[PDB]
Paper text:
The structure of the full-length Enc34 ORF6 protein was solved to 1.50 Å resolution using a selenomethionine-substituted protein. The model contains a single protein chain with 179 modeled residues; the very first N-terminal and eleven C-terminal residues of the full-length protein were not visible in the electron density map due to disorder, and two loop regions (residues 39–43 and 98–100), were also poorly structured and therefore not included in the final model. The protein can be regarded as built up from a concave seven-stranded β-sheet at one side of the protein, of which the three central strands together with the two β-strands from the opposite side form a slightly flattened five-stranded β-barrel at the protein core, and two α-helices cap the β-barrel at both ends. The ORF6 structure extends from the canonical OB-fold by having two extra strands (β1′ and β1″) at the N-terminus, a helix α1 and strand β23′ in the loop connecting β2 and β3, and two extra strands β34′ and β34″ between β3 and helix α2. The helix α1 is rather long and packs with the three N-terminal strands, completely obstructing the opening of the β-barrel. The C-terminus of the ORF6 protein is notably acidic with 16 of the 29 C-terminal residues being either aspartates or glutamates. These residues, as far as they are visible in the electron density map, do not form any secondary structure and extend away from the rest of the protein in a direction nearly parallel to strands β4 and β5. Interestingly, the very end of the traceable C-terminus inserts into the groove of the seven-stranded β-sheet of a neighboring molecule in the crystal, with possible implications for oligomerization.
The hypothetical protein ORF6 of the Enc34 phage is conserved among all Nazgul-like phages and consists of a single domain, currently annotated as a domain of an unknown function DUF2815. Here, we present structural and functional characterization of the Enc34 ORF6 that allows us to establish its function as a single-stranded DNA-binding protein (SSB) and extend this annotation to other DUF2815 family members. In this study, we show that the Enc34 ORF6 is structurally homologous to the gene 2.5 protein from bacteriophage T7, and present a high-resolution structure of ORF6 in complex with ssDNA, which reveals for the first time the structural basis for the ssDNA-binding mechanism of T7-type SSBs.
Residue numbers in the entry: 2 to 38, 44 to 97, 101 to 188
Write the structure that this text describes.
């Protein structure tokens, strides 16, 4: 089965399957080469509030549908347990940004700027560094288990869009190393 668009907006697409393409967002903390924290592949997407209002509205609507249609009944989920956070409230590079966390245990497809699929972890890590711009396909899902109630986003694919200043390495919290 293929993706079928339901609604297209500036900087994104909602598909009939519930998948969401988020376009032209800045990446942070990429873990596409190897899984990180059951370890999962992940990425953080920084959506500028000025340019991504329409796709953020879709994301909010899909989050609410995901809560409502949860299998055991409509699920009450705290704002801090959603895959989208507010960069101005909840967190410097996040200022004026919506902050999306998407994860998957299955390696997402990773495409370079020429839309070639990258297979090698070293090339994946070199191409998609924190600070570059990407587009991504995600899909919301609801979690209700012993670890809590969340609305999460599966990470299906990432496309590199453009280079920009790297955020650097030095952004890992080292404060728990001796515990
Ligand atoms: Cl980063
Ligand atoms: Mg938009």
């Amino acid at each position: 089965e293929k993706l079928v668009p339901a609604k297209k907006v500036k900087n994104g697409v909602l598909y009939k399957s519930g998948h969401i393409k988020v376009s032209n967002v800045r990446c942070s903390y990429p873990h596409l080469d190897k899984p990180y924290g059951e370890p999962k592949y992940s990425i953080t997407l920084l959506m500028p509030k000025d340019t991504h209002g329409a796709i953020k509205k879709i994301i909010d609507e899909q989050i609410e549908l995901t809560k409502k249609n949860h299998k055991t009944g409509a699920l009450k989920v705290a704002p801090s347990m959603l895959f989208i956070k507010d960069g101005d409230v909840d967190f410097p590079e996040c200022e004026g940004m919506w902050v999306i966390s998407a994860r998957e245990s299955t390696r997402p497809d990773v495409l370079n700027m020429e839309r070639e699929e990258l297979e090698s972890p070293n090339e994946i890590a070199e191409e998609i560094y924190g600070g570059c711009w990407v587009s991504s396909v995600i899909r919301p899902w609801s979690q209700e288990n012993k670890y809590g109630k969340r609305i999460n986003a599966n990470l299906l694919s990432v496309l590199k869009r453009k280079d920009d200043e790297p955020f650097g390495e030095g952004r890992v919290d080292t404060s728990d190393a001796y515990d």
